[PDB]
C-alpha cells in the first residue's frame, strides 16, 4: 500500500566526515596500517548501519570518494611522494596477508 | 577553465515546458543571451563566412 524512500541524513553525513577528519588529523603518529584500520572501522560502521540509504544519497557517494582518496593521499605523503604510478591500487587494496595495506573501498563506483 | 565566479523559479516549472529537442551547450554558446540568464563577460562570436 505504500513506499518508503530512504536517505542518509545530513547530520549523519557530516558526522562521518568529521570522523575521517580526526583520523587524518591524529595520524602523524600512526603507521600506515593503523590509519587504514581506522578507515576500515569507520567505513564499516557507516555502511552496515545505513546499507541502502547510502545507495540513494548522491551526496554520500561523493563524500566517500573524496574521503577515501584523502586517506590514500595521506599515506603517499607519509612516504615522500604523490606520484600516481609509484602507488597503483594494488598496494592499498592487497589484503594484509599478501603484505598490502588492506583497504576496503567504496570510491571506485561510477557516480 | 576554473569557474569564473562560483531556490525556486517559474519558467523552470516542469508542467509548463515542451521538450521537443533538448538544449545543449553548443546552443548555449552559439546564442549567449537567448539561451542563458546572467551571461556576463561574454563575447558573441558568429560567422556566416
Amino acid at each position: 500500500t505504500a513506499q518508503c524512500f530512504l536517505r542518509v541524513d545530513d547530520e549523519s553525513m557530516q558526522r562521518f566526515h568529521n570522523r575521517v577528519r580526526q583520523i587524518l588529523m591524529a595520524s602523524g603518529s600512526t603507521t600506515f596500517t593503523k590509519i587504514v584500520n581506522k578507515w576500515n572501522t569507520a567505513l564499516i560502521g557507516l555502511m552496515t548501519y545505513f546499507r541502502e540509504a547510502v545507495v540513494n544519497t548522491q551526496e554520500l557517494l561523493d563524500l566517500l570518494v573524496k574521503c577515501e582518496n584523502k586517506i590514500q593521499t595521506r599515506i603517499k605523503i607519509g612516504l615522500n611522494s604523490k606520484m600516481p604510478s609509484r602507488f597503483p591500487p594494488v598496494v592499498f587494496y592487497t589484503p594484509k596477508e599478501l603484505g598490502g595495506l588492506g583497504m576496503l573501498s567504496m570510491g571506485h563506483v561510477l557516480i | 577553465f576554473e569557474p569564473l565566479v562560483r531556490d525556486w523559479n517559474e519558467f523552470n516549472d516542469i508542467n509548463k515546458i515542451i521538450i521537443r529537442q533538448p538544449i545543449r551547450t553548443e546552443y548555449k554558446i552559439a546564442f549567449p543571451y537567448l539561451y542563458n540568464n546572467l551571461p556576463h563577460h561574454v563575447h558573441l562570436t558568429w560567422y556566416h563566412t
Binding site: 570518494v65 582518496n69 584523502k70 570510491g107 | 576554473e2 569557474p3 545543449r24 551547450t25 553548443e26
Partner: peptide, 26 residues
C-alpha cells in the same frame, strides 16, 4: 558536451571529472 553534467572544475575533487553516458540507457 558539458550538457549540465560533470563538475565545474575537476580540480579539488579527487577525480579527473571525466564524464560518460550511461551505455545501458534503454
Amino acid at each position: 558536451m558539458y550538457n549540465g553534467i560533470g563538475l565545474p572544475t575537476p580540480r579539488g575533487s579527487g577525480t579527473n571529472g571525466y564524464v560518460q553516458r550511461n551505455l545501458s540507457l534503454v
